[PDB]
Each structure stands twice: as structure tokens, then as C-alpha cells.
Design a protein around this nucleic acid. Structure first.
Lengths: 182, 185
DNA sequence: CAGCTCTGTACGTGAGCAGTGGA
DNA sequence: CCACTGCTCAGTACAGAGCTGT
């Protein structure tokens, strides 16, 4: 359905559950603009000006950010997924990331990482909180960073004004990681 | 490609429901007026047009059991009606009229005023003054098919905010069809 | 301004949630 | 697996400019 915007030597990679109906139709990542992504990407200072799904193909070149998902199959709809599917997805994911080895793998929303941990590391995270996670991407110096879902279905994150902090903190981490090249 | 919702249509049909075009969900689900939000299936039941509650899965049984069909003005799928070309509508109504001239349903039901406002301006060349829901004067060219306008079953419409608000016109729809079947003797 | 023709606001639910906190 | 706090998302009357006319 929706294409992977991915390059080599990338700062951040955003990682969704799977492309939404809109996404799939629009042919661009995190459209909406119910999905709070682009507003946050702006507000955070990760983007120079305000952007949108149409600017999505420019992100890695200009702001060093990639895009992808656990499962490429499009649906509503996360409750529409399964399990078998996820496990096979993480497998397909891990590989792609073992190929492009970005600096930071960002998980859009706890759900996706919950699974990913239990499947990639086989660890059931007790009281998971957002931010850097201990373990790295298998056989890679890519760290796992967990962000609250950009999806406009999160009420802990009712506005994009509510969930901007983590993006600021995300930016910082990239910076910190850039420093360690000296 | 998502891509297209099929026409459930037969010969000698009481009602044909006519949407703008198929929504993202509709197109993905492969069934008419899925949701929610669509008050259609609730109303279809609540009105008395269906024996029991139904849903998008039952869409292909409707002509057989309840003599109801389905189609839309424009086939292309989008969000999204504000996403449609003025020219696309014109080509739709043209295509539609045809369909109706072929299947000759008793009544063509128009889901929502917008779709008829255009259809009139394009099939009859008349921009209706202060349009109201219900029966319309003119029949489908070369047919005995009446035109009846319902408020959009969709749920972007605040005049019919609940599904309870839109039930009337389905009751009235039922009556009309019964009247029309009555005269069959 | 009586209508009018035109692009454009702005508006009410019930899902379906992703959270956080409880049975 | 719920109850819940808040968010979204899925056409159509109405607003003003901007007309010709008692």
C-alpha cells in the first residue's frame, strides 16, 4: 500500500503500526491532519516551518527523517490486525532497519513497542514509559525511542499541544547523539 | 487502487438508494453504507423497511428480500465529497440516468440534497428553489421512476445529527412505495 | 434589499480509539 | 477486559460580496 521513505545514515525513523485508510488513499505518511504528527514536527523545532504529508518525501533529505510501519497492509484500524501479522512485521521491520541502520528507531505509540519488545527481545515491559529504551536494535547501534501515537485517537494525548514535549526531547537526543562523533 | 464499490441492481425494483460516491471505508469494506457513521442501516430497520436490524454485509441480499438496490452518482472513491470535480458529477448523472432507464426502479432515492441539486441542474437543467426533502415533481426521463430526496445517511450532517432525526423520510418512503404497489390492482 | 450566484466557513453526534486508572 | 477523558472523523444551511430591478 504506502511506500517506505528510507535512506542510509538517517537520524530519526518514524514507525507506525500500519497505514491508515486515508494514508493509503492519499499516498503520504500521517495525512489527516487529524493525526498530530506534522504540527508536532513543526512545533518541536524538528522542522523549519509548518509542513504536511505532501512534504513527506523531502523529510530525509532536508531534516534527516525517514518513515515506515510494522505491517504494510492497510486497514482502518489497529483493532483490525491480528497477532501472527505483527510478529511477521517486526521480523520484516528489524531487517529493513538492520539495512539502513538509522540513528534512532522511533515507535509511534506504546502499543507498537509493547509487541515489538515481547517479540524482538522477548521481554514484557512492566509499566512502560515514553522515551529511550534500554535495549538496542539487534546487531545495531540503533536505539529504541518510544513516542506517544500521532494518531488522533489518543486522549492521554488529546492535542498535538499535549504531546510535543517528547519531540523536543527527541530532537535533543539526536543532537546528543551527533556530539558523540567527536 | 482501493478501488471501487459494486452496483447492487436488479430489474423491477421498488427503491434504489443513490449515494454521492463510495467513501474510503465503503471502498475498503466492499459494502454499502458501512460505518458507523452511517445512519442508513439503523434507519432501514427503524423505519420498518427491514424486518430486523442489518448491516453492510447484507447489502447484496436487499434486492432479493426487500426489493431495494444500491448505486452512487460517481464511482471514483474519495474521503470526501468536497474532493470531487464539478465535471465528474455531470458525467455521473449522465451515467446514472442511463442505469435507471435500464433497471426502471419504481423510486430513485437520493441520499442527501447536494446530489440531487446537481442531478436536477444536469438532467433537467433546473436549479431547485429552497429544496425540501421528499417527493420531487419530475420523473426519470423515459421512465415512471419517481425522485425522492432523503437527508444524507452519512454523518457529516448536523441537521440530522442523530440517526433518530432522519427516520421520518424512511417511514414516508415506505408509505410512498406501498401507495405505488397499491395501484398495482 | 426581494432574490441571486458564488466560492468558502462551521457545525452535532456516535463510533473508535490511546491513553490512564480500575474491576 | 471494562469505565473513562478527551480527542478525531464521517454534507449542507448560512454568510457575505456583488449582481438587475418596483
Amino acid at each position: 500500500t504506502l511506500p517506505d521513505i528510507l535512506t542510509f545514515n538517517l537520524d530519526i525513523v518514524i514507525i507506525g503500526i500500519n497505514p491508515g485508510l486515508m494514508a493509503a488513499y492519499k499516498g503520504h505518511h500521517y495525512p489527516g491532519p487529524g493525526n498530530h504528527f506534522w504540527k508536532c514536527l513543526f512545533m518541536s523545532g524538528l522542522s523549519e516551518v509548518q509542513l504536511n504529508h505532501m512534504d513527506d518525501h523531502t523529510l530525509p533529505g532536508k531534516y534527516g527523517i525517514g518513515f515506515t510501519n510494522m505491517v504494510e497492509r492497510t486497514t482502518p484500524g489497529s483493532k483490525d490486525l491480528s497477532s501472527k501479522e505483527f510478529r511477521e512485521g517486526g521480523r520484516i521491520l528489524v531487517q529493513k532497519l538492520q539495512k539502513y541502520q538509522p540513528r534512532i528507531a522511533v515507535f509511534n505509540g506504546k502499543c507498537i513497542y509493547e509487541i515489538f519488545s515481547k517479540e524482538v527481545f522477548g521481554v514484557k515491559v512492566k509499566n512502560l514509559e515514553f522515551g529511550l529504551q534500554p535495549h538496542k536494535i539487534p546487531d545495531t547501534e540503533t536505539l529504541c525511542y518510544v513516542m506517544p501515537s500521532s494518531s488522533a485517537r489518543c486522549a492521554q494525548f488529546p492535542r498535538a499541544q499535549d504531546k510535543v514535549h517528547y519531540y523536543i526531547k527527541l530532537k535533543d537526543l539526536r543532537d546528543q547523539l551527533k556530539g558523540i562523533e567527536r
